[PDB]
Design a protein around this nucleic acid. Structure first.
Ligand SMILES: [K+]
Ligand SMILES: [K+]
Ligand SMILES: [K+]
Ligand SMILES: [K+]
Ligand SMILES: [K+]
Ligand SMILES: [K+]
Ligand SMILES: [K+]
Ligand SMILES: [K+]
Ligand SMILES: [Mg+2]
Ligand SMILES: [Mg+2]
Ligand SMILES: [Mg+2]
Ligand SMILES: [Mg+2]
Ligand SMILES: [Mg+2]
Ligand SMILES: [Mg+2]
Ligand SMILES: [Mg+2]
Ligand SMILES: [Mg+2]
Ligand SMILES: [Mg+2]
Ligand SMILES: [Mg+2]
Ligand SMILES: [Mg+2]
Ligand SMILES: [Mg+2]
Ligand SMILES: [Mg+2]
Ligand SMILES: [Mg+2]
Ligand SMILES: [Mg+2]
Ligand SMILES: [Mg+2]
Ligand SMILES: [Mg+2]
Ligand SMILES: [Mg+2]
Ligand SMILES: [Mg+2]
Ligand SMILES: [Zn+2]
Lengths: 69, 100, 99, 56, 208
RNA sequence: GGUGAGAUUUUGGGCAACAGCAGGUCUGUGAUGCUCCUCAAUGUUCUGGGCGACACGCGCACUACAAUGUCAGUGAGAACAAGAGCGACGCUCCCGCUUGAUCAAAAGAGCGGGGAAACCACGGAAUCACGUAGACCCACUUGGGACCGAGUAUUGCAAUUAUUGGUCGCGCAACGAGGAAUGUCUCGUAGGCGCAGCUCAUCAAACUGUGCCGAUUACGUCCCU
RNA sequence: AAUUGACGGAAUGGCACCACAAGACGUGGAGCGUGCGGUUUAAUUUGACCAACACGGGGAACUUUACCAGAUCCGGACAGGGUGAGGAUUGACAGAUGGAGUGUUCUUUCUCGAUCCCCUGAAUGGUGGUGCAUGGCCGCUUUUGGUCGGUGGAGUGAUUUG
């Protein structure tokens, strides 16, 4: 009846407002658009999936494939 | 031993009518038959306590199922066998045809 | 596992309307199989139960149960709802409605 | 990884906990003879329809 | 290939489940039994009923719904299962039909004695040799009891009474608890085989 | 008494009226009224413990206290039954014959059979028998096998609080026929002896059946209940 | 004062190896297996006291499991209000945290894309209680020979005859 421990928090999803403004850079060079992230080489993922680029590793959201520097 | 016809059922009367009328078709065509063989009859048994809770005198129930089997041997050409056994079967009788 | 993707919901609804009856087995570790003119599809048993439970809370489903098995049938209100949802023509009816 | 843990032991499929009565899903006092898998209380009610008769 | 004794058990288990599914579904309609037969081309199932039109439904909608239920449950191939409906010649000689009719009357807030006497009177007019209706539960206030209503002949011992007496039991769920009803009907002629005499009746033929 | 395979409900079962009991079961059910909990849950799942823990009292079994025996050999000999499609390309159950084997049991491995009157199987069960010219000789003894130590193989995802089998030790643990009291039983029965099914991945001193050897006493009474 | 039961160390006639007589083999004394009580325990889950006690088909390693110490999930449908494609929400590699080299939660930033999320009602599930609120089933009274109307007779009547 007495727990003697702090209550479990619940995770909840962190919101990145306008997250799609990153991953894309446009230059005047009519504009030229290039991607600032790398795509997952896994065949099942495709060209629409990006890599997390953590501080020290690159991570895929769905395949969970990781590349460490 | 060209064709073996095996019939099994849980109804004694039903399995006898199927055997008798099958012999009727064979005789009406004049195909030789080795007389029907009455294989041993089997009894399946299950014994359980009568009570649903386990109180009182320990009494038991015995349940039984009887299975009857008959065997008929026919020596006839290929297309003749299908004609002989084409008739419809009563409910609850299983008929199998085997070529040894 | 009770989180139903939209694609699976549409396939189950389309199978339901075409046949008019869906039968399932009460088993948490189970898989439900169905076909839509060939092209068989599968989804967990828990997702099928969630979709039918929501439909039954609304007045669109009749339910029966016997020997660890569900039996679901669409009624007239459910037929109307499924027609708007799937964007079918007003002349469309399930099977078992055709002689 | 909570879904990998959700019903891990029930997925193994061995012992008394993997068998259910095919009528009521109870796990106590099953009749496994001839692969019936019916509990002893449900068998007495459905024995006539299955085909068992009290004679002796 | 399963052995013969395993196949016989499997057929009995299939029939018991089909019987239970039909009596739950076809409750509130006259349900009297089901016959199942296997043919080389398909499988035929005949449903006996007192209200055949209720079983069939508009056109054949209800009977086609029942076919779709069974086909999916037992993985029957398309065109390999067929269902039929036939009517009972005498409705009043069916214990299953009478028990479900009594349960409907009790749910409709009727007096226990008046409801029971109605079923017995109808059965006797139908041509039965005897009838027995038993009701038990909280018929009065807060303390359970049971009543019985009888008419005509009835036999209770031996084995021959199973060929002549038809019985059925049902549960009625009222707002204060459950009430059970049991109906027994003694029929002329045997349910197993016709032209069968009673076990202890001797007749002497008149001389020519 | 006769006739008879059988001579009195033929012998064993199953079924079994009318009235009841505050007998048992809400731990069988998608039987069920009121009531309680209901998102740090009395729902559900996962990990680990417990249900068995031990100064004692009681019911029911198994093994004995030995010679009408124990041990070691040889001989003949039954019935009821059972057996295979989730998780790992078929398979998954039950058996037999070889081999392992130029050296224990228990294993392991090849080749086959059976959907069961077609395999196991000519179904080599244990009491039993033997003129076996076998061992022991009245003692807690080669009676009895509790308790405990050490090595091994198998079932299982997991064997410690020993799963089970097999091997060598321990046998100096009681026990030498059991006070008052008390159970069941009348003919293929009592008692004795094993075997199968069931529960079952692995475990039967239990229960449900089956056969084998096979008696003494009574054919009455209302003294006790 | 009468009637029906029950009872009597009051009579009459019968019956039963769950009674005895004539006997057989045992149990009660020993070791051990199992069930019950008690004691112990975080917990040793619990029903039942001739007609409970190898009974609940109850020979429980995990599961079973109902008890104890902890950790997860929503399987709270549906209705109303609110956030919400300028993103409501799901999942997760690596490091710490938890017993836990398959995100329980935290740091980090990818993935999914209206399936949810927060609040209020309601609803579900429960081997939770109550068998003295019940149905069904079973045991026992009770292994013996017993039970009931219709019409008629007797009695003011309860009742009796049959
Ligand atoms: K209840
Ligand atoms: K116990
Ligand atoms: K005791
Ligand atoms: K037992
Ligand atoms: K007498
Ligand atoms: K008794
Ligand atoms: K009761
Ligand atoms: K009278
Ligand atoms: Mg009679
Ligand atoms: Mg009789
Ligand atoms: Mg010895
Ligand atoms: Mg040894
Ligand atoms: Mg030893
Ligand atoms: Mg010694
Ligand atoms: Mg007086
Ligand atoms: Mg006595
Ligand atoms: Mg003793
Ligand atoms: Mg008694
Ligand atoms: Mg054990
Ligand atoms: Mg646990
Ligand atoms: Mg629970
Ligand atoms: Mg429940
Ligand atoms: Mg009660
Ligand atoms: Mg009650
Ligand atoms: Mg009671
Ligand atoms: Mg008795
Ligand atoms: Mg009178
Ligand atoms: Zn990827």
């Amino acid at each position: 009846k007495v727990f003697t421990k702090p209550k479990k928090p619940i995770h909840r999803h962190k919101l990145e407002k306008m997250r799609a403004l990153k991953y894309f850079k446009v230059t005047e060079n009519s504009f030229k658009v290039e991607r600032t992230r790398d795509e997952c080489p896994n065949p099942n993922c495709g060209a629409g999936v990006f890599m997390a680029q953590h501080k020290g590793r690159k991570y895929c959201g769905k395949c969970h494939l990781t590349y460490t520097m | 031993q060209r064709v073996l016809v095996k019939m099994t059922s849980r109804n004694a009367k039903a399995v006898e009518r199927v055997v008798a009328e099958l012999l009727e078709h064979a005789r009406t065509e004049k195909v030789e038959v080795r007389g029907p063989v009455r294989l041993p009859t089997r009894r399946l048994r299950i014994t359980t306590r009568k009570t649903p809770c386990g109180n009182g005198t320990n009494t038991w129930d015995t349940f039984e199922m009887k299975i009857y089997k008959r065997l008929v041997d026919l020596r006839a050409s290929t297309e003749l066998v299908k004609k002989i056994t084409s008739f419809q079967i009563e409910a609850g009788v299983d008929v199998s045809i085997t070529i040894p | 596992t009770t989180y139903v993707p939209k694609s699976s919901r549409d396939d189950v609804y389309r199978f339901f309307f075409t046949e008019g009856v869906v039968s399932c087995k009460k088993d948490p570790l189970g898989t439900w199989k169905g076909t839509l003119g060939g092209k068989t599809f599968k989804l967990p048993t828990l997702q099928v139960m969630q979709l039918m439970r929501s439909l039954k809370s609304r007045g669109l489903i009749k339910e029966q149960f016997a020997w660890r098995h569900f039996y679901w049938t669409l009624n007239d209100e459910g037929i109307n709802y499924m027609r708007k949802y799937l964007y079918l023509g007003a002349d469309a009816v399930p099977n078992t409605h055709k002689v | 990884g909570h879904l990998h843990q959700w019903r891990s032991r029930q997925k193994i499929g061995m012992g008394k906990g993997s068998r259910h009565c095919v009528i009521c899903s109870n796990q106590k006092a099953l009749i496994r003879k001839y692969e019936l898998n019916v509990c002893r209380q449900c068998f007495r009610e459905n024995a006539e329809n299955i085909g068992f008769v009290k004679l002796r | 290939p399963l052995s013969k004794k395993r196949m016989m058990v499997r057929d009995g288990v299939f029939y018991a489940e089909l019987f239970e599914f039909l009596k739950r579904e076809l409750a509130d309609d006259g349900f009297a039994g089901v016959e199942h037969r296997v043919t080389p081309t398909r499988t035929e199932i005949v449903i006996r009923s007192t209200k055949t039109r209720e079983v069939l439904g508009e056109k054949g909608r209800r009977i086609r719904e029942l076919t779709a239920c069974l086909q999916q449950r037992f993985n029957y191939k398309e065109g390999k299962l067929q269902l039929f409906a036939e009517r009972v010649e005498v409705r009043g000689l069916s214990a299953m039909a009478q028990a479900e009719s009594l349960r409907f009357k009790l749910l409709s807030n009727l007096q226990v004695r008046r409801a029971a006497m109605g079923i017995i009177r109808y059965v006797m007019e139908s041509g039965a040799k005897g009838c027995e209706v038993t009701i038990g539960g909280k018929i009065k206030g807060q303390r359970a009891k049971s009543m019985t209503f009888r008419d005509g002949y009835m036999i209770k011992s031996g084995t021959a009474h199973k060929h002549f007496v038809d019985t059925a039991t049902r549960h009625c769920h009222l707002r204060a608890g459950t009430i059970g009803v049991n109906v027994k009907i003694m029929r002329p002629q045997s349910m197993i085989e016709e032209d069968e005499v009673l076990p202890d009746v001797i007749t002497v033929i008149e001389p020519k």
